A paper describes a structure:
The main protease (Mpro; also known as Nsp5) of [name]-[name]-2 is one such protein essential to [name]-[name]-2 replication. Mpro is an obligate homodimeric cysteine protease which functions to cleave the viral polyproteins into their individual functional components necessary for viral replication. The active site is located at the interface between Domain I and Domain II, where H41 in Domain I and C145 in Domain II make up the catalytic dyad. Mpro is an obligate dimer because the N-terminus (also called the N-terminal finger) of the second protomer closes the active site of the first protomer.
Our preliminary findings on the [name] mutant show significant biophysical and kinetic differences relative to the WT enzyme despite having a near-identical structure when co-crystallized with the covalent inhibitor [name]. The pose of the inhibitor is also nearly identical, retaining many of the same inhibitor-enzyme interactions as the WT complex. The phenyl moiety in [name] for the [name] mutant structure distinctly occupancies two conformations, while only one conformation is seen in the WT complex. A sole water molecule compensates for the loss of the H163 side chain by sterically occupying the now-empty side chain pocket while making hydrogen bond contacts with the inhibitor and protein backbone. Overall, these structures show that [name] binds with the same orientation in both structures and minor adjustments to the enzyme are made in the [name] mutant due to the absence of the H163 side chain. The fact that the mutant structure shows a mixed population of broken and intact disulfide bond suggests that the formation of the disulfide bond may be reversible under reducing conditions. The existence of this reversible reaction explains why the [name] mutant was able to co-crystallize with [name]. As the small proportion of mutant enzyme with a free active-site sulfhydryl can react with [name] irreversibly, all mutant Mpro molecules are eventually sequestered into a complex with [name] despite the apo mutant primarily being in the disulfide-bonded conformation. The stabilizing interactions that [name] has across the entire enzyme, most notably through [name]’s ability to covalently link to C145, stabilize the oxyanion hole via G143, and occupy the lateral pocket, allows the mutant to regain a WT-like conformation. (3) The ability of [name] to regenerate a WT conformation in the [name]-bound mutant structure confirms that the equilibrium can be pushed back towards a competent conformation by using an irreversible reaction, even when the active state of the mutant enzyme is found in a small proportion.
Residue numbers in the entry:
A (entry chain A), B (entry chain A): 1 to 305
């Protein structure tokens, strides 16, 4: 029993992290096959970040201006190109630790593990979720750019995120591994505000099912509700509108616990209207929304990789 | 910026996890050099667990009754011995992935990362802390025994925990890697109650310093207090008594934030007496006590391994 915020084993990703230096700027890169992926602002100085013209900045950059280092061994850069906001550095040696991998762009509400790195060296691993405003609540200091988020399917590593920047509200933003930012953000040292921090309703419900599985059941009320009525109460507390697809996804957890999805929505509705009265649910005094229905099933079943 | 519950990279430990089968029972083991460490109750059946006599049960167990499997390759068992509550299986092949390692028994209040495994395969990684009642709040299903907790010092993996059992209150208990249980617990299928769940006061204070570093500062009051006066209020809320050593350990964080330790204690005292008024601190509606002063410094500085 027990339920914990759990990240994937980071071993397969640690073997792909390198250090990319371009002048004064040093950040992390991802060495897959004979390609190194890193944020394109590695070519910016302490002044160009306000309004960088990456096409012009890349003109006076040659293959030899990129220092790619894996541990204490250097990789020879034989080619480079800019794909959106990521830089692809063609090296001459294929990474011997390259695992089976995919490039996947995730949707808001999906979760992934982040391997925070500095100078091409892993610092730690923690679980995240793509917010509805396309940001992530992470832990990133200077030099952490290039750290990647990933999911693991058995033996296939699914790369979905790369850290690029922090927003003025202490929240972070990045791109997928094809260089396209999540959301309306740009790799620019400007004032970019994020939208309203919406709560992932289907994830709260899946987390409530996890609590029922693990003994926490005081919040189970004697009420039920409808989808439209719940969404009227959810829209005032900045909750994602619940859809019929979300109900279907919660199907497995509903059948396993004998508690209908709409009955669980009524329990959430009361927790939103009455609070938690100082009580806790799975050791949390607040409603957690960073477990997908899939994370709950995986953790409660013992799925390995 | 940002502060997250962060576990060490699990890569160095994934390469040491094996599957140990003894009859019907299957659990995980730790392959270091030519030794495999696993809980001794791998030799118990579904009935002996109530009152096992491990000396007698081990008499009719031979080297060949232990099936150690690393992936799809088997290790030949050439010797076995019982050291307290762990079994040491002498194999003929040294693990080629053995990292620099230590066997360290940690104290209550220290933190470590757990690599939850099933059938010798890693499932996930999460950060824990040794509770003052010598339990841990983890996520363990059937077949997870043998999973280990660890800290990493640069390139040295410090092994400190091995999962053995769950207590009737959904909390977990285990031993160090020399077989000695943490606390008064025994590897027995009996009713073993845990003590009062005390909060690690020095860890709450270190976490409050982290909040001040990361912008959360509404809880900073205009008060101060003394050590004795704080402990009078802390003993009623089941908080660990604060000592002068704890003050010294918080020295680095105090000097970095310009906030004296006793001033921070006064802010905690008010949070204990008045609550958090529905507000949050680093995204938590409850006081977190699973960050040591060292975890805070490490995460806020960018220490790599
Ligand atoms: C990359 O290492 C670095 C990581 C930041 C710094 C601390 N946490 C992070 O996520 N990011 C940058 O250097 C980036 C440069 C590009 C925008 C070209 N700028 C940045 O992220 O600064 C943070 C910030 C930006 C705008 C307003 C307030 C803060
Ligand atoms: C080892 O795989 C297993 C892990 C338990 C089961 C789910 N979470 C855990 O931590 N532990 C055992 O099989 C163990 C056997 C030894 C005590 C010989 N027994 C156990 O942990 O059962 C849990 C329990 C014990 C006593 C009261 C209530 C529950």
């Amino acid at each position: 029993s027990g339920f914990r915020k759990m990240a994937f084993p980071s071993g397969k990703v640690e073997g792909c992290m390198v250090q990319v230096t371009c002048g004064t700027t040093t950040l992390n890169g991802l060495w897959l096959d004979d390609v190194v992926y890193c944020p394109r602002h590695v070519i910016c100085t302490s002044e160009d970040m306000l309004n960088p013209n990456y096409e012009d900045l890349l003109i006076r950059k040659s293959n030899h201006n990129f220092l790619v280092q894996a541990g204490n061994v250097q990789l020879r850069v034989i080619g480079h190109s800019m794909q959106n906001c990521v830089l692809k550095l063609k090296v001459d040696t294929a990474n011997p630790k390259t695992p089976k991998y995919k490039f996947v762009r995730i949707q808001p509400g999906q979760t992934f593990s982040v391997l925070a790195c500095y100078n091409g060296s892993p610092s730690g691993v923690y679980q995240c979720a793509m917010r509805p405003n396309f940001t992530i609540k992470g832990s990133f200091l200077n030099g952490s750019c290039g750290s990647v988020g990933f999911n693991i399917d058995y033996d296939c590593v699914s790369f979905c995120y790369m850290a690029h920047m922090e927003l003025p509200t202490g929240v972070h933003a990045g791109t997928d591994l094809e260089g396209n930012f999540y959301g309306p953000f740009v790799d620019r040292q400007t004032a970019q505000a994020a939208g309203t921090d919406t709560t992932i309703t289907v994830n709260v419900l899946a987390w409530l099912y996890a609590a029922v599985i693990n003994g926490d059941r005081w919040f189970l009320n004697r009420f039920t509700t409808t989808l439209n009525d719940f969404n009227l109460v959810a829209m005032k507390y900045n909750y994602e509108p619940l859809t019929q697809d979300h109900v279907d996804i919660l199907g497995p957890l509903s059948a396993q616990t004998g508690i209908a999805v709409l009955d669980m929505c009524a329990s959430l509705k009361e927790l939103l209207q009455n609070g938690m009265n100082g009580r806790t649910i799975l050791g949390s005094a607040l409603l957690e929304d960073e477990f997908t229905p899939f994370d709950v099933v995986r953790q409660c079943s013992g799925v390995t990789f």
